[PDB]
Amino acid sequence: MENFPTEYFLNTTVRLLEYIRYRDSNYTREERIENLHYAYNKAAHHFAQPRQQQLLKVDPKRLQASLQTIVGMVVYSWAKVSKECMADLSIHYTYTLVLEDSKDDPYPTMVNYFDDLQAGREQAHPWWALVNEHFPNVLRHFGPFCSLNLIRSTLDFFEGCWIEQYNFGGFPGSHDYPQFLRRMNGLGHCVGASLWPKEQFNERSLFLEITSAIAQMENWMVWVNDLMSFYKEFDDERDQISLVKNYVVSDEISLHEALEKLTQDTLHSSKQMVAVFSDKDPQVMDTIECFMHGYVTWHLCDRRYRLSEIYEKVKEEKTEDAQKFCKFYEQAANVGAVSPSEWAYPPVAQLANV
């Protein structure tokens, strides 16, 4: 065990929130609860169906916890899209999160992937069978271009998980490996492109804005998640391959140098996010800003990241960063700290049983 870079972590986090202009919004707590319940309720009913229960090998409690985590991420980050769109994206991003629970070799189920796809025969791999069957409910919210992005990113993700099963951090000297893997399973183009429902944006009219957002949001989104996750992943001997840990193994640098690298990229990405979009179409900048703020709010509130622990340790320090941090945290809490009992019910297992 090494000591956590609390000071360096608080500083980076604060700079991050300042760079993205983290601030209050009109998105109220009551509206969040309303959206959380709607999104959760439709998804829960979906995963509670016999077919879904039968083909999706997942521990019931893990499913319950995965669904609640994803519903939160979607509702808090895709703040500007309809309830239905939040619901359908919640189902999709829950399928992706759940695929990481499989240790099963994809090889045998992928031997006839293309031929079955071309012929329109159900896929051998159960996950593909469920996800492709459900996909139209996600794709109906987007134009052809954005849809293509969601389809590719998800295919990329499937290959990402396949690779993850080898718990390989890259060969020493394989500098290009880390980010290659991080893009493969980051779902960067899925997220980036799902921010533009055809009912709110015109894909052809904003093609350049959207394409640029996809390109830039891909890296901002995965790097921010890597950073916010750094605290929970620090002493987790079970989590052996992450962007930071692969930087260490592949680039042969220290965990600190690896963390610096991640920090420089994240901050620079944030800085350029604002510079590029602040003066563009107002609604495009709004969706982008609300996603960044929501995404951060979500990491701060979801127990999974345990950022509450950092808070408690530094809430009495009179340092500049410690102060700035606790403030942002408190802001997130006021609108985002919500008890699951207020929206996540009944449990999926209960609906499946009935």
**Interface with Mg ion (CB under 5 A):** 226, 229
What is the number of alpha carbons within 13 Å of residue 295 lying toward its C-beta? 25
* CB nearer a second copy, residue 73 or residue 214: 214
Rounded least distance, CB 186 to a second copy, Å? 13
Task: Enumerate residues 6+ apart whose C-beta is below 8 A from 86.
Answer: 35, 38, 39, 74, 75, 78
Rounded least distance, CB 58 to Mg ion, Å? 14
For position 276 contacting a second copy by CB under 8 A, the verdict is yes
What 3-state class would DSSP assign to 166? coil
Contact in structure between 56 and 9 (CB atoms under 8 Å): no
Identified binder of a second copy from the candidate list 272, 283, 308, 323, rule CB under 8 A: 272
* CB nearer a second copy, residue 178 or residue 336: 178
For position 268 contacting a second copy by CB under 8 A, the verdict is yes
Identified binder of a second copy from the candidate list 25, 132, 137, 200, rule CB under 8 A: 132
Identified binder of a second copy from the candidate list 163, 253, 255, 352, rule CB under 8 A: 163
Which CB contacts under 8 angstroms, 24+ apart, belong to 320-328?
321/7, 321/10, 321/11, 321/14, 322/10, 324/10, 324/14, 324/17, 324/18, 325/10, 325/13, 325/14, 328/13, 328/14, 328/17, 328/22, 328/300
Tally Cβ neighbours within 10 Å of residue 249.
19
Contact in structure between 72 and 345 (CB atoms under 8 Å): no
Contact in structure between 43 and 87 (CB atoms under 8 Å): yes
Identified binder of a second copy from the candidate list 21, 31, 49, 111, rule CB under 8 A: 111
Q: Judged by CB under 8 A, which stretch of 13-21, 23-31, 71-79, 145-153 contacts a second copy? A: 145-153
Q: Judged by CB under 8 A, which stretch of 22-30, 65-73, 270-278, 296-304 contacts a second copy? A: 270-278
Contact in structure between 142 and 197 (CB atoms under 8 Å): yes
Rounded least distance, CB 117 to Mg ion, Å? 27
Q: Which residues bind a second copy (CB under 8 A)?
A: 106-107, 110-111, 113-115, 117-121, 132-133, 135-136, 139, 143-145, 147-149, 151-152, 155-156, 158-159, 162-163, 166, 168, 170-171, 173-177, 180-181, 203-204, 207-208, 211-212, 214-216, 218-219, 268-269, 272, 275-276, 280
